[PDB]
Each structure stands twice: as structure tokens, then as C-alpha cells.
Design a binder for this molecule. Structure first.
Ligand SMILES: NC(=O)c1ccc[n+]([C@@H]2O[C@H](COP(=O)([O-])OP(=O)(O)OC[C@H]3O[C@@H](n4cnc5c(N)ncnc54)[C@H](OP(=O)(O)O)[C@@H]3O)[C@@H](O)[C@H]2O)c1
Ligand SMILES: NC(=O)c1ccc[n+]([C@@H]2O[C@H](COP(=O)([O-])OP(=O)(O)OC[C@H]3O[C@@H](n4cnc5c(N)ncnc54)[C@H](OP(=O)(O)O)[C@@H]3O)[C@@H](O)[C@H]2O)c1
Ligand SMILES: NC(=O)c1ccc[n+]([C@@H]2O[C@H](COP(=O)([O-])OP(=O)(O)OC[C@H]3O[C@@H](n4cnc5c(N)ncnc54)[C@H](OP(=O)(O)O)[C@@H]3O)[C@@H](O)[C@H]2O)c1
Ligand SMILES: NC(=O)c1ccc[n+]([C@@H]2O[C@H](COP(=O)([O-])OP(=O)(O)OC[C@H]3O[C@@H](n4cnc5c(N)ncnc54)[C@H](OP(=O)(O)O)[C@@H]3O)[C@@H](O)[C@H]2O)c1
Ligand SMILES: CCCc1ccc(Oc2ccccc2)c(O)c1
Ligand SMILES: CCCc1ccc(Oc2ccccc2)c(O)c1
Ligand SMILES: CCCc1ccc(Oc2ccccc2)c(O)c1
Ligand SMILES: CCCc1ccc(Oc2ccccc2)c(O)c1
Ligand SMILES: N[C@@H](CCC(=O)O)C(=O)O
Ligand SMILES: N[C@@H](CCC(=O)O)C(=O)O
Ligand SMILES: N[C@@H](CCC(=O)O)C(=O)O
Lengths: 254, 254, 255, 255
């Protein structure tokens, strides 16, 4: 039960967004929710998706995580508007189609560094700024994918960016640990989202989960959200630097 | 919230048992609990310990996991007295005192095989039998330790038994996934229990966690119980074959 | 990599297709003295005939059933008296009943489960205790594992747990024997057509999946395992211990 | 092994203490032709003096700052023009500011963080792409990593996240290049006193912990890394790819 908890959720773009799954779960358990977005188009969808939630107040903030000024000023606004928070759900990644849909060995330097900037660095800076709003401690969760642990066809530059993110989670847990701030990841199975449309062969992946994973079915955004809720609450006290695979057991087999 | 849920908890010996930490957390959450024990002293103990719980009635069953018949018959009786269950928490392990200090290379065939029997195989047989009481699906959770993953000083034969258990967990996940039975492990931090006294240089471990793990403190039984609640509930619906470390982040550092 | 003046004990040759015969060809080709242990008389007979492919000037053959403390204890004792001190051991032994290597892992029997732990993991612990006695200046022990010890692989069932056990055995043996300068390591071989492979349900489609999916897009062979064994048993791998090296065309690295 | 008639590229020798020089001593001792790349004018000076310890009939030296695409592309193209096709590349290159390295990891600047990814990870990707044109019939690429890419190690900070990146880079490069028969691997070295070690806070206390705790109860050296590189770079390790071999006295295996 999360009444009188406030969580910031970053990276809802639409109703299929994994972080909207997180939102519905957290809202149902009584949280106050603050949302951040990048595109105009995404603020519009958030305003519409808010009608399905129980939030009596719309707390929306533009934060493009490529800009230090925007993350710093964003979290500062959030602190002035709603006070201290209890956690952040990070659901942000990006890479070019142009590098994604090409050999990994042909990835461009700007492509590679772009994906690292948005998909991994962004957590470090978010954590630094959110830490300011968690003087009593709290919890930070980022969304990763199995392709950060193993080479997966076509995930390419994004696999390297998730490996980097997963380590970022471990170094931040060590660092922020003494401040009672836990940092973890959920390694989500494949889910039809907007971003999923730029992974070559996504449908083939989806079906192979169905055929092969222990549970013989894919997961959805709400199941990510239910585990998010575990990690962001005191239930997962004593759990930090961890990666939870929410993926039908797929990670455990070969 | 676990009202209208029934769980079998194996391996309470005394107030300090990790499984009592589980009992307290589930009991708080409104579950019906069934207990299994090995020796009669754990029974009296247990009868006195359920005075703390809000369990309206004592459901206790002697099961030695070394006996197929005791596992088979015991779960059969559980079904008869209580009907279908929702999950099993496994908190059971044994090695001989001498095999837990000095030199692993000197471990006896009998001691090695004994620790495998009780600490790993017992989970295979329990799963098979408990599955009968879970036609709609359910959740099995076993307790492991970081030594199944890295060679830890002194843990010796138990670390090879844990490594066995952790793969047991993965093979049961794959097998019982199509029946909607999830199987996971909690890798608990060091905790002062009755079995913990059998381990050479326990105290030193305890202190090194406080010094070196991200949270700079030890975990307790209730922290394991809280994550047990997650694994045993629908909150963890898409998670199977997983191992969650409830250990202050210690697994994540070196 | 020259191993003249070196002596190795190779445990678990049953025929020409055995992984250990790959090792033997490689170590022999490199000048090592080789000493062979076997279980069934038929394996010995197969050793006697396969030795005439090697440039070993004599046959050192010892019957060791790793289920028996006496036979391991006495076989190594005897090996030491015949050839002297050794440089290392290559362990290539495992066993499970067929009745437990298909269908449902949740149906494994206790005796089937403990049998596979005994032969396939414990044997390494007692072999290393006895072999230490012949390596007063240090040495190298290498065991043979498979991916299925790390991940649940269809049909490998009771063996995957035995291998998970083995891989942890290697780690604990590494820790405990390091101060004595004995390295302990594991080679994780990809699927190879052997006599024990015949017991693993689905083996053909596992061979074929490696071919289609593994980075090198081909299967590996016993000599490849041998070349990595040569590295692991020799001073080329000083500093390396408690390690698991995958000789599997890269399959472990992909999902 | 034996590496006569083979040609390797070694990137990242600054002085006699560099890991890459250990690699070079071993490969040179084994008969390989060696070609050397460097960034600072000082590193070329050191290389010219270190070449005297080696049996290289010719100095083949090339300035390549891996921050510049044109330098990597041009350098490797000149290498192909001077020495022909090559058999592999040893990559021993990393960098992070002291200023990000010695603050809380959560205080890492964006600039610092991306610099470290560029130099320490991305560089492998473009090296491999350029190196591949000189490997029409296959070859081997080895990069250098540290346990701190697998676990959070105190003070290693921004370099751990860049090693985690480098290690994924290896697997992805492994899968992509497998079918060209180029293998890609990492050596996870234990702590060795070198010029770069001086930027990692707490370094001596880390050395000491290895001594007191690593199974072999001792630290390793540059030459041990190079013996494992010779293995990875030779046909000894055919079948082996996307692998991370720890040359660290067994410390990765313990808690
Ligand atoms: N779908 C899957 O199968 C899968 C599996 C495992 C992990 N994940 C991870 O889950 C997370 C969420 O992705 P998703 O699948 O839910 O796709 P999504 O709905 O497309 O969400 C991705 C989000 O990233 C935000 N974003 C990208 N660049 C940003 C920037 N520079 N500044 C601020 N926000 C930025 C986008 O915002 P704008 O649209 O406003 O630009 C968008 O809301 C990602 O980290 C993804 O890698 C996805
Ligand atoms: N304490 C820790 O730091 C720690 C950390 C990580 C993991 N663990 C794991 O947590 C689990 C519980 O141990 P604990 O620390 O809570 O100590 P504990 O209270 O002493 O519990 C061990 C339990 O195992 C039971 N048991 C042993 N052999 C049995 C058999 N043949 N049949 C039925 N039950 C048997 C014992 O029952 P009887 O006394 O009735 O024989 C006892 O109740 C174990 O699996 C252990 O490996 C402990
Ligand atoms: N082929 C593969 O794809 C594969 C892959 C990875 C790992 N491995 C591993 O490689 C090793 C060798 O197996 P393999 O594939 O080479 O097939 P193999 O030729 O059948 O070798 C198996 C050996 O184990 C021996 N053995 C069984 N129980 C024994 C006992 N109690 N005492 C002494 N020896 C015993 C057998 O001896 P007897 O015939 O005399 O009984 C036989 O020589 C095993 O550890 C296996 O698990 C195999
Ligand atoms: N020493 C250890 O304890 C340790 C442990 C594990 C892994 N490693 C790794 O081993 C590798 C070698 O480092 P080391 O310890 O040998 O220290 P080192 O002697 O200082 O070597 C580092 C090398 O990196 C090169 N380099 C840095 N930036 C470059 C760039 N932008 N373009 C081209 N070259 C560049 C340096 O060249 P210039 O001097 O010309 O600038 C130098 O030759 C690194 O990848 C390091 O992460 C070291
Ligand atoms: C099979 C891939 C599963 C997956 C789907 C969508 C994912 O989201 C992305 C992908 C690329 C760029 C930005 C976000 C993802 O990370 C992982
Ligand atoms: C320091 C090891 C932490 C730990 C404490 C108690 C543990 O429980 C045991 C130990 C030995 C035999 C049977 C059960 C354990 O597995 C692990
Ligand atoms: C795909 C399976 C690869 C493999 C083949 C043979 C193997 O050897 C066995 C198998 C079962 C029992 C005893 C020894 C193996 O371990 C692994
Ligand atoms: C304990 C640290 C071991 C180690 C020492 C030196 C290392 O090389 C570096 C470190 C930081 C920046 C640039 C190169 C290293 O990667 C790892
Ligand atoms: N392959 C993608 C879409 C088209 C493509 O890139 O091949 C998919 O099926 O998900
Ligand atoms: N094709 C496999 C599956 C049959 C089985 O073993 O049950 C085999 O013949 O080994
Ligand atoms: N002691 C450090 C330098 C100073 C620090 O620890 O911050 C070293 O070994 O490089």
C-alpha cells in the first residue's frame, strides 16, 4: 500500500509504454504520481491517460535527459511542487534506426554515444538530482533488457547501452547505499511498444518466448508494474544492486 | 494481501529461523499457513511460536525430506486437511559440522551426498508432490546463499549444495512453467540462525557485510519474508527461475 | 606450448569419439607423458587399441571407478609409484540413468539424482584430494562441464544440476588448493557426438541449433576441447583458476 | 604455441609496465610479427626503446588516437599496405579523467562518462571494423577488461560502467563477426601496477586484498596476461569466442 508515497515516472509516450503499466499499478496502490516527458506529443498522451488514473492532480514536466539543465531544473521544480519523493521509475532509452538496423561492427561513433547518453548516463544524472529530494532515502528502478547480458540478434548498439545501464545500477547502489537509496533494474521481456518497432525481428523474438520460455507466454506492461511496485516499496528493503527478470523465466533457460 | 491464500512453510526450528520470518510476514498478510518440521523439539517450539501468529489453528506435519514416503504422505495429508494450496516456502538444508570448516578437498562422499540430498534434491520431491495441490498454478520459493555462486571461505560442501539448489530451481521453473507454477530462490544475507552457528567464521562474514555491502547493514528474517511475500503472490506473476538477493547489495560488489 | 617432461592423468576415455581422446591426441602431440584411467573393461580394450595412434612409448592404464573411495585412493597411489609425480589431471567423467534424461525433471528419483552427483561432481573432489599427493610443487586440474549447468536446457534435466554442482566444485577446489599452487578449472564444451550424448533426448536438434545460432555457426570437436585443455594444463594459464572456459562456438554468449 | 608467419597489431603500449608490453614480450618470444600503435609522442619514444628487448627485425609504429575515425581508418589501412593481412589485434586502451574517477560515482559528469565510453569501449567497435579488412580469412581480437565491469568495485566508478560496455561490445562483436571467422574475446586482468593504475584511488589496498584473498594468494603480472593472450590469439582457442577469461589469481571466483 503506497498512500502518502510520491514517485516520479519517466518516459511514458503512450498507453503501450511500459512506464504506463508501472503508472496504473502505482496509482491503483494509492501513490501520488509525477510524470516527466520529452516530446509535446507525449505530454498530450499523458493528459489523456491521466483520465484513467486516480490522480486528483496532473504533475507533468518536460525533461529531455540529454540536457543537464533540464534534469536539474526539472527535479528542482518537482521538489518545489510536491516536496520530497520516495522514488523514480526510469523507463527511457533511445537509439537510431540507422545504427540499430545495421551490423553491430558498423555502428557509428555518434550512434553509440547517443545510445549511451540517453539510455545509461541519464540514470546517473537523474539519480544525482533525485537524491536531493530523498533525504530520508528511497528507491530508483531502471528498465533493462536481456540483450545487455548476452548478444541478441539486432539489438546491437542497444545491448551495449543496457550492459552499461546495468553496471550503472550497480555503481549507483554502492554509491547511494549509505544514503538509504536503493537502485535496481527490471529486465523486462519483449512487449509491443513504440520503441519496440525499431528492433529488427521483434515479432520473431516474441513468438520464441511463447514457444520456449518456462511460462510459455509473453509478459505485459502491468507485470513490469507489479514488480516495479515491489522494488519501489519497503517490501524490497534489503534488495539493492539487483536485476529482476520479468520475462517468463526466459533468462534462466538456453 | 494474501487472504484466502494457503502456504506450506518448511523448515522452522526456532524464533530465529528464516522461515519464521516468512511465517510472520505472510501471517500479517492474512494467509493461511501450514508448517512442516523434522524433529519433535521443533514441534513444541513451533506450537509456542504460533502463539505470536494470528493463525486460528495449528496445521503441523512432521516431514523429513530424506524420506520420499514422508514427503509424499505429508503433502497428501495437507491436501486432505486444508485442500489446494497456493505455494511452498522451502527453508531446509543440512551438512555435517566437520564439512563446514577447514578444507573442502577433504569432504567425505557421505557428507557431500547428504548435503545434496537434504539441501537440493528435497526441493525436487517437494515440488512434485506440492504440484498435486496446485492444479491452477502456484509458486515455490527456496532459500539459497551467495556461496552457491562464488567460493566462500568455510561454506565448502554447502556452497556446492546451494549451487545445486539454484540449478534445481531453474530446472523446476522450466518443467513446471507450463503448469503455471513458478519457482524461485531468495539468496538471503548472513543472519544469525541456529544452522548459521555450524558455519566456520560466521561472525566475520556478518561484520564484512556491514562494512562493504551498499546498505552498510545486515538484513533480517523479516526482510527475507517480505520478498518471500512478493515471490509467493501475484505481484511476481511474470518472474520465474529467478534468484533475488536479499543481502544489502553485497552480491553486486567486489 | 611444449609439454615434454610433463605427465598428465586423463580420466574418462571410452572410445575414439570420447572428449578425453581429443585431449589425449593434443597432449600427446605436444610431448606429455599420459596415464589413463577407465571404468569398464571395454574402455580399457578401447584404450589399448587407441594408444597405437599416440606416440606414447608405453601404456599406463588404471581401472578407476570413481564411485569407490578405495579405487580412486589406490589407483592414484599406484600411478604415483609407476610414473612419479604428475603435472595434472583431466576429468571427463559423468553419468546419469537414461530414465532420468528426458521427459520431466520434477519426476527425477532420489537415487538417480544422487548417482549423477556422485559420479559427475563428487568424483572431482576426491580425485583432487588424491592427486594433490602427486603434485607437491603444484599442478593443474581440469573438469568437463556443459552450458546446462548454468541454464535450464531442455532434457538435460538431472545432469544440468550435477554440472551446476561440478562448476561450484571447481570453484571451491580452486580456493582450497590455490595456496598449494594447484589450479582448478572447467571447460564448457558445446555438444559433441559421443557415446554419452546418446542418452540426452533431443541431441540432434541441439547440434543443429548451434550451427544456426552460435556466433561461429558450426559445432566444435573433441580436438578443440583438447587444445583449450593444453592451455589449461600448462604454464600458459598461470594466474587462471576457478575459471570456466566455454569451447562452444560462442553459444554461451548469445540469447 | 607457435606464431611464426603470423602478424598481430598491439594497441596501447605507453611504457615497460604496460599490459600490452607483456603481451608483446610473449608474442615476440613466440615468433610473431608485431605492429604497434600509440597515441602520445612519448609512447612512440618508449616503444622505440622497448623494441630493442624484442626480436622484431623491423619497427612498425603507427599513431592512432582511437578518438578519431580517420586515424583508425587510415592507420589500419597503412598497416595493411606495409605488412599485408594480419592475424589479430590486441586492444589495451582505456581512459577516464581523474576528476570523474575520484568523486562519487553519482557525481560523474556527462562529458567524463561519455569520454570513457568513447575511448574504452567504442574504440573496440571501430578497430574491429577496420581490422576486419585485413583478416579476409579470419583472425582474433582480444580486449582488456577488469572485474569492475562485472561488479561495483570501490573507486573504479566511471571505468566499471565503461568496462561493462566493453564486455557487451565483445559479445556483440563476437556474434556479428563469427561468420567471418574472427573471434572476439576479453582478458579480465587482475590489478597490475601500471601508469593508468595511478588514477584508480585505493589501488595498493586492492593489490593487497588480492594477496590475502585470491585463491593463488598472489597478484599476477603483464606476462601472465600475455601468455593468455597468445592462447586467445592463436589457433589454440579455436571454438572460443565471446569469452571473458580472468587472469586474476581466481579472485573473480570468490566472495
Ligand atoms: N518494449 C520492450 O520489449 C522492452 C523490453 C525491455 C526493456 N525495455 C525498456 O523499457 C523502457 C521504456 O521503453 P518502451 O518499450 O516502453 O518504449 P516507449 O513507450 O517508446 O518509451 C520510451 C520512452 O523513452 C523516452 N525518451 C527517449 N529519449 C528521451 C530523452 N532524450 N529524454 C527523455 N525521454 C526520452 C520517450 O519519450 P518521447 O517519446 O517523449 O521522446 C519514451 O517515453 C526503455 O528503457 C526500453 O529500453 C523495453
Ligand atoms: N542464516 C543464514 O545466514 C542463511 C543465509 C542464506 C541462506 N540460508 C538458508 O536458509 C535456510 C534455513 O536455514 P536457517 O539459517 O533459517 O537455519 P535453521 O533455523 O536452523 O533452519 C534450518 C532448518 O532445516 C531443517 N532441516 C534440516 N534437515 C532437515 C530434514 N532432513 N528434513 C526436514 N527439515 C530439515 C531444520 O529442521 P530441524 O531442526 O527440525 O531438523 C531447520 O528447521 C537454509 O536453507 C539455509 O541454507 C541461511
Ligand atoms: N559430448 C558432449 O556434447 C558433452 C558436452 C559437454 C560436456 N561433456 C562432458 O564430457 C565428459 C565426457 O563425456 P563424453 O561426451 O566424452 O562421452 P564418453 O565418451 O561416454 O565419456 C564418458 C566417460 O565417463 C566414464 N564414467 C562414467 N562413470 C564412471 C565411473 N563411475 N567411474 C569412472 N568412469 C566413469 C565412462 O567410462 P566407462 O565407459 O568405462 O564406464 C566414460 O569414459 C562428461 O563429463 C560429459 O558430461 C560432454
Ligand atoms: N593495470 C591494471 O591493473 C589493469 C587491470 C585490468 C585491465 N586493465 C586495462 O589494460 C589496458 C591497458 O592499460 P594499462 O594498465 O596497461 O595502463 P597503461 O600502460 O597506461 O596503458 C593504457 C594505454 O591506453 C592508451 N590510450 C589511452 N587513450 C588513448 C586514445 N585516446 N587513443 C589511443 N590510445 C589511447 C595509452 O596511450 P598513450 O599513453 O599514448 O596516451 C596507453 O598506451 C586498459 O584497457 C586498462 O583498462 C588494466
Ligand atoms: C527484443 C528487444 C526487446 C526490446 C524492445 C524495445 C526496447 O526499447 C528500445 C529499443 C531500442 C531503442 C530504444 C528503446 C528494448 O530496449 C528492448
Ligand atoms: C556465512 C554463511 C551464511 C549462511 C548461514 C546459515 C546457512 O544455513 C545453513 C548452513 C550450514 C548448514 C545448513 C544450513 C547458510 O546456508 C548460509
Ligand atoms: C546437448 C548435450 C551435450 C552433452 C552430451 C553428452 C554429455 O555427457 C553426458 C550426458 C548425460 C549423462 C552423462 C554424460 C553431456 O554432459 C552434455
Ligand atoms: C584496481 C584497478 C585495476 C585497473 C587498473 C588500471 C586500469 O586502467 C585504467 C584505469 C582507469 C583509467 C584508464 C585506464 C584498469 O582498467 C583497471
Ligand atoms: N523485422 C521487424 C520489422 C521489419 C524488419 O525490420 O525486418 C519485425 O518483424 O518486428
Ligand atoms: N530425438 C531425441 C528425442 C527422443 C527421446 O530421447 O525421447 C532422441 O532420439 O534422442
Ligand atoms: N591512494 C590513491 C591516490 C589517492 C586516493 O586514494 O584518492 C592511489 O592508490 O592511486
Amino acid at each position: 500500500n503506497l498512500e502518502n508515497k510520491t514517485y516520479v515516472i519517466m518516459g511514458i509516450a503512450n498507453k503501450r509504454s511500459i512506464a504506463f503499466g508501472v503508472a496504473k499499478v502505482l496509482d491503483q496502490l494509492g501513490a501520488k504520481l509525477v510524470f516527466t516527458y520529452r516530446k509535446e506529443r507525449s505530454r498530450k498522451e499523458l493528459e489523456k491517460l491521466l483520465e484513467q488514473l486516480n490522480q486528483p492532480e496532473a504533475h507533468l514536466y518536460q525533461i529531455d535527459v540529454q540536457s543537464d539543465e533540464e534534469v536539474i531544473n526539472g527535479f528542482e521544480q518537482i521538489g518545489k511542487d510536491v516536496g520530497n519523493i520516495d522514488g523514480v521509475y526510469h523507463s527511457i532509452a533511445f537509439a537510431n534506426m540507422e545504427d540499430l538496423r545495421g551490423r553491430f561492427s558498423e555502428t557509428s561513433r555518434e550512434g553509440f554515444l547517443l545510445a549511451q547518453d540517453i539510455s545509461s548516463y541519464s540514470l546517473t544524472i537523474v539519480a544525482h538530482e533525485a537524491k536531493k529530494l530523498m533525504p530520508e532515502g528511497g528507491s530508483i528502478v531502471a528498465t533493462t533488457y536481456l540483450g545487455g547480458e548476452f548478444a541478441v540478434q539486432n539489438y546491437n548498439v542497444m545491448g551495449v547501452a543496457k550492459a552499461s545501464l546495468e553496471a550503472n545500477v550497480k555503481y549507483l547502489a554502492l554509491d547511494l547505499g549509505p544514503d538509504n537509496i536503493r537502485v535496481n533494474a527490471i529486465s523486462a521481456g519483449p512487449i509491443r511498444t513504440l520503441s519496440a518497432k525499431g528492433v529488427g525481428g521483434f515479432n520473431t523474438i516474441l513468438k520464441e518466448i511463447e514457444e520456449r520460455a518456462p511460462l510459455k507466454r509473453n509478459v505485459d506492461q502491468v507485470e513490469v508494474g507489479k514488480t516495479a511496485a515491489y522494488l519501489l516499496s519497503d517490501l524490497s528493503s534489503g534488495v539493492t544492486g539487483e536485476n529482476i527478470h520479468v520475462d517468463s523465466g526466459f533468462h534462466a533457460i538456453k
